[PDB]
Amino acid sequence: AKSKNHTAHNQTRKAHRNGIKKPKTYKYPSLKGVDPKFRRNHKHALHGTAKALAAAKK
Amino acid sequence: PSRFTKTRKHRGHVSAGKGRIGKHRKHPGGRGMAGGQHHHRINMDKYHPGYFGKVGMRYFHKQQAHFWKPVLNLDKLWTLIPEDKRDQYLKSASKETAPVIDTLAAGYGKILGKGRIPNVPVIVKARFVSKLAEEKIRAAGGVVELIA
Amino acid sequence: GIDHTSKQHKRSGHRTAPKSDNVYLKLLVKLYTFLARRTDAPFNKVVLKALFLSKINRPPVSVSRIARALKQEGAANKTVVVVGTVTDDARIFEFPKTTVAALRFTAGARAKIVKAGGECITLDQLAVRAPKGQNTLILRGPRNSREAVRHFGMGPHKGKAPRILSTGRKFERARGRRRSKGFKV
Amino acid sequence: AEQVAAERAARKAANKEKRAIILERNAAYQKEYETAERNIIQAKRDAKAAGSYYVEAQHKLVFVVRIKGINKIPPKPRKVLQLLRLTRINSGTFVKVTKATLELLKLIEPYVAYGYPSYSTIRQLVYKRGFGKINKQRVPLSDNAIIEANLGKYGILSIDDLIHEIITVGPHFKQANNFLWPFKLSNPSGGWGVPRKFKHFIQGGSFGNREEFINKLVKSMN
Amino acid sequence: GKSHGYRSRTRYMFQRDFRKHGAVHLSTYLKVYKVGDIVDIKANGSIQKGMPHKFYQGKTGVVYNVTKSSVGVIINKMVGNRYLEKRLNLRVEHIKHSKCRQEFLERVKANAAKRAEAKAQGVAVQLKRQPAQPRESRIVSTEGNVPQTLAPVPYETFI
Amino acid sequence: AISKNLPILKNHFRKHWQERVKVHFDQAGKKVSRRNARATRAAKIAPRPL
Amino acid sequence: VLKKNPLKNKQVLLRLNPYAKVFAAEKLGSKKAEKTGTKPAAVFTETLKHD
RNA sequence: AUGGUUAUAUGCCGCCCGUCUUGAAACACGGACCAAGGAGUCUAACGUCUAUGCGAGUGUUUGGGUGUAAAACCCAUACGCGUAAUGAAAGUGAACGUAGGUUGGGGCCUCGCAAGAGGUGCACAAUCGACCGAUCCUGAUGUCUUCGGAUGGAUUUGAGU
RNA sequence: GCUUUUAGUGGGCCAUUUUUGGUAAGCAGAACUGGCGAUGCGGGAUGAACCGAACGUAGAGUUAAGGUGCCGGAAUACACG
RNA sequence: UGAUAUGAUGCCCUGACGAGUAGGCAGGCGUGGAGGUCAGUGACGAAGCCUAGACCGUAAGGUCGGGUCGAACGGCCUCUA
């Protein structure tokens, strides 16, 4: 009772039925996995420049 | 009703929506939760992680009346004053005439401080209070009286 | 013999009539189909599309969500339009004087809005007050705060609230959920 | 509200000024075409007299007819044929000749026949099979206002404005050509002239560069 | 049995490019990679630490995380009917900047300058690129260049 | 037998459950007969509360 | 309602393209060219009839 | 008379259906013929979607009152689910702030003949934070001197705010 | 652009080109594309896959592949062997 | 959507498209019974049955004439199996 083992037939015709999709890039990508010593400080860089810009509307 | 059912639409067509090759059989993969670790493993992980195994300690004869402690947030807490007296007590926000709020008779075991009561002094009859529920109640000029 | 670049006979995918048989709702669609066709105002093309929506797709707008929307700058005197249901919020203790137009108000929302001296009008009184959508502010409720969308996209490492009847210890908290029992999602 | 002729005579007068503009611009177009062809003939003769060879300019525009049907097409020429708006057999388009289109034509060569169309072929094509893409809905041209309300942003406001933006390939060739719905040509009236269509025109078939003889195709297929 | 290890089918890929073996030159360690730089991945065979998989050889992505002896590179991977975003912590010996972005940033300075020069002199800038346009008409002279008549050649063996 | 993102159900129907189904059709009937029993008791116990 | 052909149906040929009325006037498609008596160079003929 | 139906003649075409199968007219299986019967149903618990009533609530119908009597109508207290989560548990328990900052964002508002500029931006999407629980670290005033756990954190964690 | 939900399916086969085992096979197994399955029409007499071309009901015209002595619609056409 | 004439799920203009197994969805045809209605049909002939007789619908089917027959049965709006 032998049979076919493997084929890549129809797999590209299948993948292009729904038209192989791009990963939809964003502005402000995620800081996940970015170096934590940079990422720790970047919290304080953003918080300080929000305090300084809200100070412009005192 | 059976009039609006898709079995009235497979009259005439042979396999009744079940396929020629598939040939709808009685139990092709088992019965019920059968084979969750063997041939239904890719469904068990991915949509039910954590199913198999043991966590924690057993509680012989657990009664869920010992653990009766429904929570009430500082969000509402004025719904336990009726509406005809709610506008009366909200104005004249002062001590020596302060609304006693019976939270246990209202059906709550614990007061929690989710946020922003008005600055009226109130009297809270509670069993359990959190930290922040007591701090915000006292910052409005009220107290909490623990009862049983 | 045509090499088709797209699916033939495809519908638009959007609602053109509401699925309901609410006769007063279809009179509101009859009013706003007229106004979207013959006024060229961008407002009326929005309200007509919103009048079609299903009960999931029009979540209730709280009355405290409205009072937050009038705290926007310049929006203190705008007519807030809610295509759906205005619900009361006991967590807000001061409500402004504004006018609200909506499909339905609950008996607590209407009692709160008129208590501050506002008016609860309907969507056709709005279209007599403002046919082109003058001085309005369309508010929509939170769509992704239902219980069902917790479970949408359930998979490994996605954290999407497994479909389960009973919740606590010994119901899906074990092998697959902590590192001490095999693997962790 | 008068409106019987208080606006009707104004509309008739405005259409008359439009029609005078179209008349003088078509006269300018005709004079330019005639001087262009005479000047190429005289450059040829005045190079032959001078002991030289006037090479012509390379052709800036081809007309392409899809020659093969729908079935059994590989994905790359099928994708290019979808991009050149040739989605059925015996359909044609005008293509501006650059390298980025020469390589497309070299890709779909065993499925199309193309060449260099004259003024007269373009003229008969837009006059008989000329259709526009107006909210798309395939509107026949049939009147100069149909062209003007869709291409007056580029200056084109008549049918010879369309032909002039095709043949002389203009600064607005892309918009004027994308406006034209692809020409649903018929089969040729004289036949194809070959027993077997699907070899090259050099090998005695139909596909490939059929250069000036593309007119002999299209005027029978139009 | 089959073998599908981490470095299977890489006989010639991580080979070290004949008569350029040995240690690597020091301008590999002196490039400055900033977050957003477009890099090319070519795995150095002699540095076994921090190598990419053989899929990512010749793949081009952007830098997302810059640390001590490596950078984090974002690569799109074609898998199924979608693309996934892949994150690679690769040492800087297996990497170099792209020159195709050096096509871009130098053409940005050219395009922005030609817009300013045309603004002062006669706008109609015309600062797009154009494809290879076909050739113009010209007159080629036969003076000193009388055409030689070439005929086809008979068959000869010559072995 | 386990296929979709559906919650794991516990339907305890593996016994002979169909032999022990008690549908309460006599809810109205037992209500009427119970009111009649209370009326008869109030008649027998004639001056007293129920 | 119906597509009238130009290049026959002279009225629709006149509705489009108002130049056509004068294209039949001066006839403009059977115009003669001006006769110019230039002869080719000798070297052109030598390379034409060369063996 | 045209036309329609019907039988027949003529020209060309047309292999028994159903089924399993890569492939059935098959030298594969069932089918002599006819009439009637004949196969995705109901229930318990659920997923998505939709419609409807109400809405931080909701669900009268276990039961009671009633009745023209298995209908209809009316109702108290409970309880179920929801409004709080997280931990194995003891337990603890959701605002620094216009309930945050940025990037888009329909709609509305102001100027304009328009093109456009600016303001406000619901939902939704991306991001950086803040809050609550668990884990790990820190251990203030105090102390039945070993209890207490303030304050501050952390590439940790949650089916949360 | 995005999301949910669910059916059937998870025996395949052939053709061009590349290619493995085999003396080979209407053999066994791969790669890419196109087909058949799932598909009728014109041609190859006949045939699942080849060639042409993909199909609502009709009318007119033109052709594709294939053909034009007769069966058989269409030259016992013309030209050089 | 402006009435004083009736379909706004309407009517009308415009363009393109139409193969199909397994399968999904939609609009309908028919049957047994239930609620409402047509103050419906009917011993002066209901239902049924027969009818190379007619009409409508792409179709599921519906309608009419003639014969036979003798006691009940349909159209429409919904419910149900």
From Swiss-Prot, chain B:
One of its GO terms (biological process) is cytoplasmic translation. A motif (Nuclear localization signal) lies at residues 6-12, 23-29. The keyword Transferase does not apply. GO terms for molecular function: RNA binding; structural constituent of ribosome. It is found in: Cytoplasm. GO terms for cellular component: cytoplasm; cytosol; cytosolic large ribosomal subunit; nucleus. SUPFAM superfamilies: Ribosomal proteins L15p and L18e (SSF52080). The keyword Ribonucleoprotein applies. Pfam families: Ribosomal_L27A (PF00828). Residues 1-38 are annotated as: Disordered. Keywords: Cytoplasm, Isopeptide bond, Ribonucleoprotein, Ribosomal protein, Ubl conjugation. InterPro entries: Ribosomal_uL15, Ribosomal_uL15/eL18, Ribosomal_uL15/eL18_sf, Ribosomal_uL15_CS. Residues 1-13, 20-29 have a biased composition (Basic residues). There is a cross-link at residue 95 (Glycyl lysine isopeptide (Lys-Gly) (interchain with G-Cter in ubiquitin)). Component of the ribosome, a large ribonucleoprotein complex responsible for the synthesis of proteins in the cell. The small ribosomal subunit (SSU) binds messenger RNAs (mRNAs) and translates the encoded message by selecting cognate aminoacyl-transfer RNA (tRNA) molecules. The large subunit (LSU) contains the ribosomal catalytic site termed the peptidyl transferase center (PTC), which catalyzes the formation of peptide bonds, thereby polymerizing the amino acids delivered by tRNAs into a polypeptide chain. PANTHER family: 60S RIBOSOMAL PROTEIN L27A, LARGE RIBOSOMAL SUBUNIT PROTEIN UL15. Belongs to the universal ribosomal protein uL15 family. This is Large ribosomal subunit protein uL15. It comes from Saccharomyces cerevisiae (strain ATCC 204508 / S288c) (Baker's yeast). The lineage of its organism: Eukaryota, Fungi, Dikarya, Ascomycota, Saccharomycotina. The gene is RPL28.
UniProtKB/Swiss-Prot annotation, chain C:
Keywords: Cytoplasm, Isopeptide bond, Methylation, Ribonucleoprotein, Ribosomal protein, Ubl conjugation. One of its GO terms (biological process) is cytoplasmic translation. The keyword Cytoplasm applies. Gene3D superfamilies: 3.100.10.10. GO terms for cellular component: cytosol; cytosolic large ribosomal subunit. There is a cross-link at residue 115 (Glycyl lysine isopeptide (Lys-Gly) (interchain with G-Cter in ubiquitin)). There are 2 genes for eL18 in yeast. Component of the large ribosomal subunit (LSU). Mature yeast ribosomes consist of a small (40S) and a large (60S) subunit. The 40S small subunit contains 1 molecule of ribosomal RNA (18S rRNA) and 33 different proteins (encoded by 57 genes). The large 60S subunit contains 3 rRNA molecules (25S, 5.8S and 5S rRNA) and 46 different proteins (encoded by 81 genes). eL18 interacts with NAP1. Belongs to the eukaryotic ribosomal protein eL18 family. This is Large ribosomal subunit protein eL18A. The gene is RPL18A.
Swiss-Prot record, chain E:
It is found in: Cytoplasm. It comes from the Eukaryota. There are 2 genes for eL21 in yeast. Belongs to the eukaryotic ribosomal protein eL21 family. GO terms for molecular function: structural constituent of ribosome. One of its GO terms (cellular component) is cytosol. Component of the large ribosomal subunit (LSU). Mature yeast ribosomes consist of a small (40S) and a large (60S) subunit. The 40S small subunit contains 1 molecule of ribosomal RNA (18S rRNA) and 33 different proteins (encoded by 57 genes). The large 60S subunit contains 3 rRNA molecules (25S, 5.8S and 5S rRNA) and 46 different proteins (encoded by 81 genes). This is Large ribosomal subunit protein eL21A. Its main location: cytoplasm. There is a cross-link at residue 31 (Glycyl lysine isopeptide (Lys-Gly) (interchain with G-Cter in ubiquitin)). GO terms for biological process: cytoplasmic translation.
Swiss-Prot record, chain F:
Keywords: Cytoplasm, Phosphoprotein, Ribonucleoprotein, Ribosomal protein. GO terms for biological process: cytoplasmic translation. It comes from the Eukaryota. The keyword Transferase does not apply. The keyword Cytoplasm applies. It is found in: Cytoplasm. GO terms for molecular function: RNA binding; structural constituent of ribosome. GO terms for cellular component: cytosol; cytosolic large ribosomal subunit. Component of the large ribosomal subunit (LSU). Mature yeast ribosomes consist of a small (40S) and a large (60S) subunit. The 40S small subunit contains 1 molecule of ribosomal RNA (18S rRNA) and 33 different proteins (encoded by 57 genes). The large 60S subunit contains 3 rRNA molecules (25S, 5.8S and 5S rRNA) and 46 different proteins (encoded by 81 genes). Component of the ribosome, a large ribonucleoprotein complex responsible for the synthesis of proteins in the cell. The small ribosomal subunit (SSU) binds messenger RNAs (mRNAs) and translates the encoded message by selecting cognate aminoacyl-transfer RNA (tRNA) molecules. The large subunit (LSU) contains the ribosomal catalytic site termed the peptidyl transferase center (PTC), which catalyzes the formation of peptide bonds, thereby polymerizing the amino acids delivered by tRNAs into a polypeptide chain. Belongs to the eukaryotic ribosomal protein eL13 family. This is Large ribosomal subunit protein eL13A. It comes from Saccharomyces cerevisiae (strain ATCC 204508 / S288c). The gene is RPL13A. The chain holds residues 2 to 51 of 199 of the full protein.
